Design an enzyme around this catalytic site. Structure first.
Site, PDB file in Angstrom:
ATOM      1  N   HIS B 354      -2.706  -0.034   7.250  1.00 19.84           N
ATOM      2  CA  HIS B 354      -2.375   1.023   6.295  1.00 19.84           C
ATOM      3  C   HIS B 354      -3.481   1.512   5.371  1.00 19.84           C
ATOM      4  CE1 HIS B 354       1.971   0.541   7.152  1.00 19.84           C
ATOM      5  NE2 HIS B 354       1.630  -0.721   7.333  1.00 19.84           N
ATOM      6  N   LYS B 545       2.526   9.882  -7.456  1.00 16.07           N
ATOM      7  CA  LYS B 545       2.125   8.810  -6.543  1.00 16.07           C
ATOM      8  C   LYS B 545       1.449   7.782  -7.438  1.00 16.07           C
ATOM      9  CE  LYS B 545      -0.385  11.927  -4.514  1.00 16.07           C
ATOM     10  NZ  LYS B 545      -0.287  11.856  -3.017  1.00 16.07           N
ATOM     11  N   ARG B 546       1.187   6.587  -6.922  1.00 14.27           N
ATOM     12  CA  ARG B 546       0.532   5.563  -7.731  1.00 14.27           C
ATOM     13  C   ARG B 546      -0.813   6.062  -8.283  1.00 14.27           C
ATOM     14  NH1 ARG B 546       2.550   0.171  -7.464  1.00 14.27           N
ATOM     15  NH2 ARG B 546       0.731  -0.248  -8.797  1.00 14.27           N
ATOM     16  N   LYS B 551      -7.003   8.554  -5.152  1.00 10.97           N
ATOM     17  CA  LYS B 551      -5.997   9.602  -5.093  1.00 10.97           C
ATOM     18  C   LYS B 551      -6.434  10.790  -5.959  1.00 10.97           C
ATOM     19  CE  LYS B 551      -2.168   6.531  -3.994  1.00 10.97           C
ATOM     20  NZ  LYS B 551      -1.612   7.130  -2.752  1.00 10.97           N
TER      21      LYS B 551
HETATM   22  C1  LIG Z   1       7.101   8.569  -1.071  1.00  8.20           C
HETATM   23  C2  LIG Z   1       6.762   7.581  -2.219  1.00  8.20           C
HETATM   24  C3  LIG Z   1       5.471   7.121  -2.418  1.00  8.20           C
HETATM   25  C4  LIG Z   1       4.297   7.490  -1.488  1.00  8.20           C
HETATM   26  O1  LIG Z   1       3.646   8.650  -2.046  1.00  8.20           O
HETATM   27  P1  LIG Z   1       2.190   9.121  -1.552  1.00  8.20           P
HETATM   28  O2  LIG Z   1       1.886  10.407  -2.229  1.00  8.20           O
HETATM   29  O3  LIG Z   1       2.138   9.037  -0.093  1.00  8.20           O
HETATM   30  O4  LIG Z   1       1.209   8.040  -2.084  1.00  8.20           O
HETATM   31  C5  LIG Z   1       5.173   6.402  -3.548  1.00  8.20           C
HETATM   32  N1  LIG Z   1       6.135   6.110  -4.446  1.00  8.20           N
HETATM   33  C6  LIG Z   1       7.411   6.506  -4.253  1.00  8.20           C
HETATM   34  C7  LIG Z   1       8.438   6.088  -5.278  1.00  8.20           C
HETATM   35  C8  LIG Z   1       7.739   7.264  -3.146  1.00  8.20           C
HETATM   36  O5  LIG Z   1       8.981   7.866  -3.062  1.00  8.20           O
HETATM   37  O1  LIG Z   2       1.627   3.818   5.701  1.00 14.77           O
HETATM   38  C1  LIG Z   2       2.382   4.006   4.519  1.00 14.77           C
HETATM   39  C2  LIG Z   2       1.414   4.125   3.390  1.00 14.77           C
HETATM   40  O2  LIG Z   2       0.660   2.890   3.262  1.00 14.77           O
HETATM   41  C3  LIG Z   2      -0.282   2.850   2.150  1.00 14.77           C
HETATM   42  O3  LIG Z   2       0.400   3.098   0.951  1.00 14.77           O
HETATM   43  C4  LIG Z   2      -1.378   3.959   2.330  1.00 14.77           C
HETATM   44  O4  LIG Z   2      -2.231   4.012   1.191  1.00 14.77           O
HETATM   45  C5  LIG Z   2      -0.667   5.353   2.569  1.00 14.77           C
HETATM   46  O5  LIG Z   2      -1.590   6.332   2.944  1.00 14.77           O
HETATM   47  C6  LIG Z   2       0.414   5.293   3.689  1.00 14.77           C
HETATM   48  O6  LIG Z   2       1.116   6.523   3.756  1.00 14.77           O
END
Ligand SMILES: *Cc1c(COP(=O)(O)O)cnc(C)c1O
Ligand SMILES: OC[C@H]1O[C@H](O)[C@H](O)[C@@H](O)[C@@H]1O
Ligand SMILES: *Cc1c(COP(=O)(O)O)cnc(C)c1O
Ligand SMILES: OC[C@H]1O[C@H](O)[C@H](O)[C@@H](O)[C@@H]1O
Lengths: 815, 815
Positions: B354, B545-546, B551
């Site tokens: 990942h 996102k985190r 990012k």
């Molecule tokens: C979908 C989701 C993520 C993943 O977000 P990305 O932009 O791919 O890093 C992280 N946190 C929560 C709570 C989510 O619903």
């Molecule tokens: O594979 C699910 C997720 O795994 C990790 O959070 C990666 O940083 C992200 O890019 C990916 O979408």
């Protein structure tokens, strides 16, 4: 939103009628939906749970109705505070009190299951050490049966009294993980969590004292229903659980456990005080949370009427902090003036004393109190000063009395005498048996009795006839009911009517038959789960209770060794066969008590394998004695051993259990034994030994065990055998501690009662040789045991202490 | 006992039909019997639970049937091992998949309750950090919907991802006590507890190695059902809980907590490796218990057929110990020869990677492994030697390659590279997006790809359309269904049909209307629970996102400051109003990430209170971003920010959530962004910045942030503002760390993409000024998002890795 619609939300036609068809349907629903199992993967344990949940439904419907009834009526409420509640198993007791056991028996049968096998799967709720905890459980049953608005408040320990394993003759302790498979009877109430404070400091504002900078621990309640006997009244037992508040990162989360340790384990001490901080935290914890609950309930339907709607009973001094805590809330938080708050407190609280042994009395060092509960220590000192000022007024110049009655004990280590605190802040103080209550007035609390004679009362203990007769001895209950009906179950005094069948040959035969079947059953249980082989035709000599020096299991030991030496001396002489059974747990750090257990097993090693002894004498140590085992062994007993030194057993309750179940009693004039002989007639009791006054004489002149050793050959022979390693071949001096104690440091005068005990035991054997006369004496016992029903005790507490009237009026069924 | 009688014990006609009348009856039963409440004391929380239990009944009936079906059929079983499962709320998802939401809506309405209000009471199950954990939850939903015999195995953390509080602009962490009120969806299975070993030593017997003198921790499973979309298939998610075995006394009991700490809390790190012992214990814990469960199930309907009935998917390297553990069991316990066991292991395991960031890779020091798991370290070395011998045979004399591919890393601190271990013991290794899978083959795993090209695959990530469209955006789901039906919900590729309505004025109006309503709703939610006032007519610019440097939330920050400076320069010039929203949690010990959050709030302090800015620009930090908040904000978004540096975001999934819900995307050619633009057409995407190859060029020659500072006036002005304390008046040098990092130690080249980003953002604003064209581009996005359904991803895993065929065949209802 039309609020009229919510009227559909009712318990009104829910569980269905208590008939077989509906029970099976519900059993099915629970097995699948509640437990998520099917008939293919289900085990007996799963079936037990499905049945428990099915019975719970009916119990809960009445629970809700009872609580609704109390909200409407708003009766005076009784709060029984105890750090122990020895409940035992709940399934059968629930079925019997709700009159559901027949339908459940039938429903399970039709499903291809056996109900008795399912019942044996239930874990004992062992949140108690022995008599004190079991009394609380009996009282709860009685208060419900007498229709009182009562609540039991305690702590929900994660681990109850340890499970006892015997390894190489020694006791081994194993944590009692009683919640492993879950507890279907309790209901968590996270929505009613309350904060409890610890440590901090006291700061004085212009308007009063303030307890600040305190550490907070949350108290989460768990409710357990307690059903009365067929009156549809279901009361509540609320047990508190410690939870950490939500306010490196990982370590901070892991450290939450520190706060939750408060309700982790029950201290395994019976009649012994261990001044540990954790224990004190437990005591304040239960008290602080409980009182907040009480005040809230009071404000929801000023404080001048508090005593008219609230009664708080303190089970021993364990919950004694309730007095200064009630004062703290009333003065610091509600801002009442001191004298008014005090008046309310004294009128609300009542204290029950359970022991006279000095090592059982709680005396907390003030340094522990000032750091843990600074504000309570301040309140206690204030209480003390105002109490002492009253003493000085009634006895001018008596400086000695002032020192003796003080709540504060001088010495290098200043300590607070919790019993004195309870007497000062309670409107009633009671002993648990006539002789004990008298001793309280004549000795330890003499000073307090002279100041306020009106405070001291007696409330002789009792046991509930539901669990201790109907439940554990159905065979006996049945033959009694066939002659006098079923009304005795909630009016035990009716057993009196049986005195009319003392000469009836039919009854005599039936009583003796019920006992033989109970003995056959017990001998079968022993071989199955504990492999050996007792003779079911021998006299079942039983002594089961916690191991303690004052209970004198050692005196029992001396007698069985006397019996063994006698047979060996004259092997071809006839003797009434006997199976001597001794069981009970020892506190972990009680060295002598653990040595006594080893002595008992060591005696059995010799006696049980001596070929010339044969089937005439068998000594068995019943391991892991607890409520569910008591329910099995007591109904199978012939002789009940209640041999504590006169003046040491406050009351005793096991003694009553045995009397109710057809066993004759051999004992000293101690505790309730005095009243039992009184009720049955001293000629139908096997009494022996020193009376309290004789023990006093011996003490004045001085106890010299050597005298008895020198004058009694059989006793000398026993001690010689113990010192020579006769019972411990590979370790000759193993019992050196026991021998030295008996000879030079015996506080309980075992030797002084040896001669009378052996002679008395001889009379027991003589009478057993005559079945007809033995059984006729038994009937005289069972028939006069009515006074010892806890319904009688509770009725007395309600009327003489709480100011509430008992009632057998039955409430309406849910529908 | 007639066994035929037990046939009555069936789930056969139980929960009743899924009609309103029966639901109300059950709701009533649960409120009273399950929760022990009545309409007088019940709170909304109580009503929520009564409803959850009512829906659970229907879910459980199908659960039992599904598990029975699998026992009969015995299909190949798929085990998805993950240390994270970010589930979110369960009530609505369950109602939708079981097609019960209408009847429940009606039943609650008739009782005078509002279902939407009840749903908001449910706690998010946050047993995950972000993308990795959420992917696992989406996969579980898809595997159930595709009828696969799948089981999710993980750890039941007592505390999930912390709750985020913002105090003075700073993040504060609060323990997530998600189990406080109980979890109605899980079922404890104490009867299936298994032992897990730690420490000890290895001793060699004549017949093999033996792991002895180990410490034991018990693993107790908790089962949670996972429903497929209307096919009546309910799979299982089994989460393990740590329990201490039952074998001073008080201290010994209290110390039990030490063993139970293993499953106490989720490590809050996202894409970062912390080599702590507790974490390693967690990893072996889940692995050891899971594999025992797998072997047992296999033996209950030799090992040569193991790979034909079992597939184990490793979610990242967290559960990598499953490889040496499987070997340990097969060789040490089952006594298979090494080569045969290895063959079975490789054929059973598959590994999913990942991330490419070096600081996210697990490299455990061997000293920690040899003390904690001595036997596994031995097995790992053996695996390494035999693997290296194969490398040497394929590339003779290439000693450098041998050093690079070794499972053991030299250096002072010897470490085990877990990713290398996974590649060696798996028959399939996959990336999560085309560009990422290619990078794995071209860079970090180049050596492994050259040795075994056949092992490497790609499986582009996806999201479940049930929760991420039907559940969170019913308004959108409805207008789409009115034109093309409901078949797209389990066949997202059908959204393609919408390309036929790109010119339809009705559709255009409807799409724009659904978005405005979602925005109005979100603005209302913000004022209610978080008080401020965003303009619902502005462009909703969202980045959730985190918080991570890769990012690039900082790049976003630079843009909003550019926007603010622009307005201040020419205040009376028109600009497309914007509400910029940034949310996300930072790991506790990630200083820079916590500084970035403070910068975001500090920017809002200035911009939000500048009167000349007015309603044209608002910067909001959404606190406590989690699954349930994502469900609210995503459907209200206009612009999705996916601006990670090219080559750092393996895939991303939030990007897909936004595409599916009507937001346009501004991003770099990174992760799945490449494939999304591919599907929608690059002209319907807002792409900007360096491509992976450009980042490589910059790296070769050297990144010099000063160059950009010197050549871009607007950028220079921003840095000057940050260093002077323009955003931190009372502490002028508060952001010194951020400024220094950007200027001299930026691994993610924020400055290098600044110019293109701002220009690209200008084009977004231009298009928003034309509603009709904006909405038409949106439709082109929603219509081509089908490839990103997790049903597609799972279908590919099943066919290309697991060797099992997906299926939409619906199972029969319980009755
Ligand atoms: C979908 C989701 C993520 C993943 O977000 P990305 O932009 O791919 O890093 C992280 N946190 C929560 C709570 C989510 O619903
Ligand atoms: O594979 C699910 C997720 O795994 C990790 O959070 C990666 O940083 C992200 O890019 C990916 O979408
Ligand atoms: C009744 C009971 C007791 C009290 O017995 P005594 O002989 O009064 O000390 C102790 N333990 C259990 C389990 C009981 O049932
Ligand atoms: O009062 C209940 C019991 O309390 C204590 O255990 C006393 O030792 C015992 O004599 C009494 O019966």
């Amino acid at each position: 939103s039309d609020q009229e619609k919510r009227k559909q939300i009712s318990v009104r036609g829910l569980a269905g009628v208590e008939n077989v068809t509906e029970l099976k349907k519900n059993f099915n629903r629970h097995l699948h939906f509640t437990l998520v199992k099917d008939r293919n993967v289900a085990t007996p344990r799963d079936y037990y749970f499905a049945l428990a949940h099915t019975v719970r439904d009916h119990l809960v419907g009445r629970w809700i109705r009872t609580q609704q009834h109390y909200y409407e009526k708003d009766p005076k409420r009784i709060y029984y505070l105890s750090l122990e509640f020895y409940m035992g198993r709940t399934l059968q007791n629930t079925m019997v009190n709700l009159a559901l056991e027949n339908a459940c028996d039938e429903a399970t049968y039709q499903l291809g299951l056996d109900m008795e096998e399912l019942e044996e799967i239930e874990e004992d709720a062992g949140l108690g050490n022995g008599g004190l905890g079991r009394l609380a459980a009996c009282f709860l049953d009685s208060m419900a049966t007498l229709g009182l608005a009562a609540y039991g408040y305690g702590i929900r320990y994660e681990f109850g009294i340890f499970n006892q394993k015997i390894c190489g003759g020694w006791q081994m302790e194993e944590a009692d993980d009683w919640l492993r498979y879950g507890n279907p009877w309790e209901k968590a109430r996270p929505e009613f969590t309350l904060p409890v404070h610890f440590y901090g400091r006291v700061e004085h504002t212009s308007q009063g004292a303030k307890w600040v900078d305190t550490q907070v621990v949350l108290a989460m309640p768990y409710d357990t229903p307690v059903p009365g006997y067929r009156n549809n009244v279901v009361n509540t037992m609320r047990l508190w659980s410690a939870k950490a508040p939500n306010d490196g990162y990982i370590q901070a989360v892991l450290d939450r456990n520190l706060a939750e340790n408060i309700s982790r384990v029950l201290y395994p001490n019976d009649n012994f005080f261990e001044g540990k901080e954790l224990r004190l935290k437990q005591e304040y914890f239960v008290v602080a949370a409980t009182l907040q609950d009480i005040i809230r309930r009071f404000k929801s339907s000023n404080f001048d009427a508090f005593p008219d709607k609230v009664a708080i009973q303190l089970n021993d001094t364990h919950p004694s902090l309730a007095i200064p805590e009630l004062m703290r809330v009333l003065v610091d938080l509600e801002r009442l003036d001191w004298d008014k708050a005090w008046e309310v407190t004294v009128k609300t609280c009542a204290y029950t004393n359970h022991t006279v042994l000095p090592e059982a009395l709680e005396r907390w060092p003030v340094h522990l109190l000032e750091t843990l509960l600074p504000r309570h220590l301040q309140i206690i000192y204030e209480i003390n000063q105002r109490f002492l000022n009253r003493v000085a007024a009634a006895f001018p110049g008596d400086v000695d009395r002032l020192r003796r009655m003080s709540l504060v004990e001088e010495g290098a280590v200043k300590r607070i005498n919790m019993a004195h605190l309870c007497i000062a802040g309670s409107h009633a103080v009671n002993g648990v048996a006539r002789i004990h209550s008298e001793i309280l007035k004549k000795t330890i609390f003499k000073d307090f009795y002279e100041l306020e004679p009106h405070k001291f009362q007696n409330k002789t203990n009792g046991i509930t006839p539901r669990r201790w007769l109907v439940l554990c001895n159905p065979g006996l209950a049945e033959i009694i009911a066939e002659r006098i009906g079923e009304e005795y179950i909630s009016d035990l005094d009716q057993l009196r009517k049986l005195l009319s069948y003392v000469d009836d040959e039919a009854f005599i035969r039936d009583v003796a038959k019920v006992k033989q079947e109970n003995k056959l059953k017990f001998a079968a249980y022993l071989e199955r789960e504990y492999k050996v082989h007792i003779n079911p035709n021998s006299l079942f000599d039983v002594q089961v209770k916690r191991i303690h020096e004052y209970k004198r299991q050692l005196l029992n030991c001396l007698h069985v060794i006397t019996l063994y030496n006698r047979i060996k001396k004259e092997p071809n002489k006839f003797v009434v066969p006997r199976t001597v059974m001794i069981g009970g747990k020892a506190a972990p750090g009680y060295h002598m008590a653990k040595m006594i257990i080893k002595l008992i097993t060591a005696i059995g090693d010799v006696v049980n394998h001596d070929p010339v002894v044969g089937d005439r004498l068998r000594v068995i140590f019943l391991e892991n004695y607890r409520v569910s085992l008591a329910e099995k062994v007591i109904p199978a007993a012939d002789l009940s051993e209640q041999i504590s030194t006169a003046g040491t057993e406050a009351s005793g309750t096991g003694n009553m259990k045995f009397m109710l179940n057809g066993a004759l009693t051999i004992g000293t004039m101690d505790g309730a034994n005095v009243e039992m002989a009184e009720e049955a007639g001293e000629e139908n009791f096997f009494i022996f030994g020193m009376r309290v006054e004789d023990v006093d004489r011996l003490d004045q002149r001085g106890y010299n065990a050597q005298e008895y050793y020198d004058r009694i050959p059989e006793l000398r022979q026993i001690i010689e055998q113990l010192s020579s390693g006769f019972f411990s071949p590979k370790q000759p001096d193993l019992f050196k501690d026991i021998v030295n104690m008996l000879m030079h440091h015996d506080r309980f005068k075992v030797f002084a009662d040896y001669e009378e005990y052996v002679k008395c035991q001889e009379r027991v054997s003589a009478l057993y040789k005559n079945p007809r006369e033995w059984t006729r004496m038994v009937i005289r016992n069972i028939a006069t045991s009515g006074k010892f029903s806890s319904d009688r005790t509770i009725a007395q507490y309600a009327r003489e202490i709480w100011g509430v009237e008992p009632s057998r009026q039955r409430l309406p069924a849910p529908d």
